[PDB]
Design a protein around this ligand. Structure first.
Ligand code: L00
Length: 379
């Protein structure tokens, strides 16, 4: 109810389509920049040279505390890539924990399809583990430096709100950001924030696929990816089921492939005709699972409105991946997500800013009995 972490509430801005970012102050004297909150990577990097899409950038020569590591780094993602120079400098988060640490920082000098026009962020905060850091796992990630250099508890939580901001609570949980109970799923391995999906239902109907397919390769939570990305075989089955459940109105095939958009008169989108999606996650007790339910308001995302027109355009936010399942921002938006690194688990609870209607609401429910969940993981 109360809020000891009140000063961290609403410290995020942005949206699912372009990313959620937090202010971070680097160097001395202070240089504050807007940084993308990214749980799908582990490198802390900031644009360090002028770029058409950047309003500001890190000026290392002006920072007396900057230490050049004399080594370059190249980081490619599923989307975009950048090259920069490695170094370290003092870093603080104005609206985050009351601490200052010396962290590794990559100064981005060149990039390709990474920065996004109009996103308003100039850097990225990789919050995942050292195993996937570049050049290698010896480059300590920011959060690891934070936990080793201070007494801030090894945990952070994210409340991403869609429609235009959110909250990143560092060091704890803020009870005003969620309702009901928090349900935890184990972090299977500490590299990406890997989880295990044991069952998938579309409008209460089991997709009936071998659960190994749901996590083929891996299933991760990435606040820096827009969509719910699914392995080809799973994507096809889910789309066929979703299409059948929303047969009231016919949509072109390209819509389900993100090739076509569909717009409705302002305030007329028939949410009720679209099904809810339930993803069951492995629980903390043997043979016990829980599920998070996703509404169409989540998987149908508004595409940057033309200019206050009488039409709301939407893009299907479920797509395919060849590298496993990715639970992106549209999935996280309906919930308060706790990245409990200390106890190697991720918690989900109904968000205090969950976008629902008078008929249905996003939810987190349990417990359910699910046998042989261990066998759902890929080895
Ligand atoms: C406008 O571009 C489309 C949306 N966007 C940008 C994300 C910022 C918004 C959340 C984005 C980022 C990545 C993606 N790949 N790898 C990552 C990291 C590891 N999070 C790093 C990162 C790279 C580039 C920008 C921001 C962060 O993200 C991916 Cl697969 C996709 N898809 C293809 S999608 C539309 O979601 O199916 N889209």
């Amino acid at each position: 109810r109360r809020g000891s972490f009140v000063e961290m509430v609403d410290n995020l801005r942005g949206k699912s389509g372009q990313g959620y970012y937090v202010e971070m102050t680097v160097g001395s004297p202070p240089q504050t920049l807007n940084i993308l909150v990214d749980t799908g990577s582990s490198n802390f990097a900031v644009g360090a040279a002028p770029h058409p899409f950047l309003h500001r950038y890190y000026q290392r020569q002006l920072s007396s505390t900057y230490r050049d590591l004399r080594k370059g780094v190249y980081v490619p993602y599923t989307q975009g890539a950048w090259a920069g120079e490695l170094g370290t400098d003092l870093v603080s988060i104005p609206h985050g924990p009351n601490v200052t640490v010396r962290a590794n920082i990559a100064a981005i000098t060149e990039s390709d399809k990474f920065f996004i026009n109009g996103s308003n962020w100039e850097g990225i905060l990789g919050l995942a583990y050292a195993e996937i850091a570049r050049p290698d796992d010896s480059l300590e990630p920011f959060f690891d430096s934070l936990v080793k250099q201070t007494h801030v508890p090894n945990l952070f939580s994210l409340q991403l709100c869609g429609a235009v901001g959110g909250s990143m609570i560092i060091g704890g949980i803020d009870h005003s950001l969620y309702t009901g109970s928090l349900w935890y799923t184990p972090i299977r391995r500490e590299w990406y924030y890997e989880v295990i999906i044991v069952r998938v239902e579309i409008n209460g109907q089991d997709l009936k696929m071998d659960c190994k397919e749901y996590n083929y390769d891996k299933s991760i939570v990435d606040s820096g990816t827009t969509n719910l990305r699914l392995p080809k075989k799973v994507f096809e089955a889910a789309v066929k089921s979703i299409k059948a459940a929303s047969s009231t109105e016919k949509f072109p095939d390209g819509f389900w492939l993100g090739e076509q958009l569909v717009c409705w008169q302002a305030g007329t989108t028939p949410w009720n005709i679209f099904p809810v999606i339930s993803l069951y996650l492995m629980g903390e007790v043997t043979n016990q699972s829980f599920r998070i339910t996703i509404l169409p308001q989540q998987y149908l995302r508004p595409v940057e409105d033309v200019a206050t027109s009488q039409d709301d355009c939407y893009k299907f936010a479920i797509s395919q991946s060849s590298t496993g399942t990715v639970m992106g921002a549209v999935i996280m938006e309906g919930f308060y997500v706790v990245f409990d690194r200390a106890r190697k688990r991720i918690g989900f609870a109904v968000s205090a800013c969950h976008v629902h209607d008078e008929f249905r609401t996003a939810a987190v429910e349990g417990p359910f009995v699910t046998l042989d969940m261990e066998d759902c993981g890929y080895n």
